[PDB]
Symmetry: D2
Subunit: 248 residues, 4 copies
């Protein structure tokens, strides 16, 4: 596989996009640390990866806690000896409210996971990668890293911040054998959108020129490309996988 | 004046861009609440505004404290009866370090002032504006809301987030008689930059096609335009005042 | 007036945004060359401007013809002595058709006016501004300088190109006392479907675009160059 | 091969990025039409592709001539029966002059190849793709589709236009089983750059945070990804391969 013997960390890997990324990494021969805040999801993800013949291990972490993220990177090295690839994917949507109505608690929570947790991951991933010859980071952003999501101002602000952080890391580490890029999915059909009525999902779909929502596997293909040596001249960039959402 | 008898709040108005904005607002007839964490600076700004024929009052606030931001808007209404215009300007540059070396507390300090304080301002400003017929908000971002500042990842992340928040508020409040836009200055001549060597200053100027740094009054002219009725069809937007910095 | 004793040129000034720009320039004291391909609309614009107390003169030009644009700048200097400000505004919508269906000549016609005419204006305006101490250019782009307009691919391509041209002029002339910026209006007066794409819940008015052009043409915008400036009612925020 | 049973067209394929794209397509099983104005370059490219085990045929075309582009697609169908993938890559650099000094013929020439030729390609490619059930187009843009290249205003204008055309095609054809995306390379090491001195190339490399120029194969990897089913939810987008150039 194209990631043979690389060690890869994925946060939020118990479901959705992160689960598809963990599967993709493992299918291409990486040794994958599956991290999630939910141990049942994380353990099941690992068992499913191994059932297809891949190599994976579970490590629990809440990415909003910098101590836990630091320990997660240390545990990755303890288990597999190094860190070559990291995908900072864990995130939450937050409450839906007008900005003037937005709860202080929901603002803090969304920014703590979707931004601070990505920074903590990058921080400790970068420190380990400088010890084993470099590596590659993919940050999960969103279309809402470049356009608004009305009623989700904390999410939009955090995802914009992830785009900026990614530009900074790419520029700073360009000559340190480390690359960092961000992925911007549009709306992806996962059990998270379960509560939407058919009419609500049809309204969402109408905002995608391709006439459907995306699949987690289609995001994971882009993450895999950006994590592999095929993307060797790509750093600091933001890469849409949006069905045309932001083209209009 | 083009803001005659509008009530306008400026945070961080004791120095630099914020001071120039407060003077510009007052020159155009606004009743200005000068807010700053430094009472000496804020009271001096009010005195200088009054000596040039304008109207202003000082209210102390730390924008990283949401109770103090809510109280700042309340005090504005106690003094001048309403809130028509707000410029969320207060910010800090932060420590300079590679992302992997960036301090945990340093990261949170930059985000708390440069992003959370802007959100707190917008939240309590919007609350009041809905009570008195609408209003206009200008958020101070940076060129580093759209391009990296190597060694300043927290600042870049915060300023990117301000751009996203601005898009969200503009979209959400478009039919609520409220507008919100962001300004993106490049490097501006202030005493903050007088510590740089001859070498460092010339290198910074070399990144601006106009061949010089900007002046605070030049930023304030754009803030003034975006705070006035002349910008009546402009909302959710990001507006450079950058000497060409991001054109290349 | 904030443009007192400046000489300003506006293309496509017989109607719509260009007419509002010419009025705004003249109200602020500029001597305005109203240019349009339609003599009747341009002469009427000049008469309305003078009726308001301003100074204006008409010069006909087809901006798709580079010789006529060069002559337009020459006539500006013959009439008012110099050129301080130029707004490259003349444009056309073009046929509505899928990109694969778009006519070859229809494509070129939209690009010739909406891009080549803006370049010809910039070229000869820059030439003159370098003789009289610099100046300021505003290029009329569109929201479709940064997002697609389905069935109008030629227009979208042309307006994207105007944004890039503007970045290049701003960068090139930064130390030559010349600034150049681009304005990006959304839709300016079913209209219901169109209005639903604007968060402000209405279309824009030409005077609202003109206020931004005036700001970018004045000394108030003195540290602004190479930039793209939306006046879009929130259209591109989502 | 991930392009088994596909037919792919590449313009400007006798050298540089286009040659690398043609090789990458052929390596993955596509039947490749190599097009170029230079018959010696194009026939040699085909010779090299076949020596690597691939399938390819040469067709001469000047992309600024719409009749030749129409004939190029017609000949592709005559040789291989269908058209699945097209990379519109042929381009020129243009006169180096200030915008006010730029030649009228120089402007026309750059736009005729770098924009009109891309449009002609898309037009006749889309026409055939509609006849055989869909397809994928990749348009070669540049970093100068989003940032200036001083002294190359025509190039920057044209490449910006290609980004806009790509957004339009992606949005218009989203439900017609056609995707269209643009690639934005920074400066790539090819014989084209041998006219620069030791000093000029060092200055050019200093504008890339990765500390080197790109290789044509690194661009071709992104083109291949965007041409394959791996990018199935990606359309209308612009994708940098820039070594960090536009991150700052
Ligand atoms: N429509 C979409 O799904 C969509 C659109 C754009 C971007 N994204 C981004 O994609 C990423 C994944 O989204 P998804 O829809 O696949 O989510 P999901 O809810 O399907 O899976 C996310 C996982 O993250 C886990 N998680 C949450 N907080 C965590 C923490 N602190 N540490 C570890 N694990 C944690 C959850 O338990 C869950 O297993 C997020 O960053 C999201 O914002 C998703
Ligand atoms: N080169 C530049 O100066 C530059 C460039 C781009 C953007 N900006 C942005 O412009 C804004 C002002 O920058 P400046 O250089 O004029 O700053 P400055 O330091 O000259 O003035 C900023 C003011 O903010 C006040 N302040 C700091 N923390 C505060 C808090 N928590 N609550 C309230 N007030 C607080 C300070 O006391 C000071 O009076 C900031 O948002 C900054 O990031 C400045
Ligand atoms: N909804 C909108 O109206 C809208 C939105 C975004 C951008 N724009 C841009 O604003 C500009 C003006 O729009 P408007 O609404 O004022 O248009 P309008 O049709 O009201 O006026 C345009 C003027 O341009 C003139 N003109 C056309 N071709 C010309 C040529 N070759 N040489 C000289 N003059 C020529 C016309 O005769 C007319 O007087 C155009 O560039 C347009 O693309 C308009």
């Amino acid at each position: 596989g194209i990631l043979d013997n690389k060690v890869a960390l994925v946060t939020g890997a118990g479901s959705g996009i992160g689960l598809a990324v963990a599967h993709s990494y493992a299918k291409e021969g990486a040794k994958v640390i599956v991290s999630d805040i939910n141990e049942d999801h994380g353990n099941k993800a690992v068992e499913d990866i191994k059932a297809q013949g891949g190599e994976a291990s579970f490590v629990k972490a809440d990415t909003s806690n910098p101590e836990e993220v630091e320990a997660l990177v240390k545990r990755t090295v303890e288990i597999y000896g190094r860190l070559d690839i990291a995908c900072n994917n864990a995130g939450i949507g937050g409450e839906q409210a007008l900005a003037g109505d937005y709860g202080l608690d929901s603002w803090r929570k969304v920014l703590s996971i979707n931004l601070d947790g990505v920074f903590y991951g990058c921080k400790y991933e970068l420190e380990q990668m400088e010890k084993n010859g470099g590596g590659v980071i993919v940050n999960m952003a969103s279309i809402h890293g470049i356009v608004a999501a009305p009623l989700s101002s904390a999410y939009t602000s955090a995802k914009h911040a992830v785009v900026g952080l990614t530009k900074n890391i790419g520029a700073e580490y360009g000559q340190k054998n480390i690359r960092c890029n961000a992925v911007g999915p549009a709306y992806i059909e996962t059990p998270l959108l379960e509560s939407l009525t058919k009419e609500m999902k049809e309204a969402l779909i109408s905002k995608h020129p391709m006439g459907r929502l995306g699949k987690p596997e289609e995001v994971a293909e882009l993450v895999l490309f950006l994590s592999s040596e095929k993307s060797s001249f790509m750093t600091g960039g933001y890469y849409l996988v949006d069905g045309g959402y932001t083209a209009v």
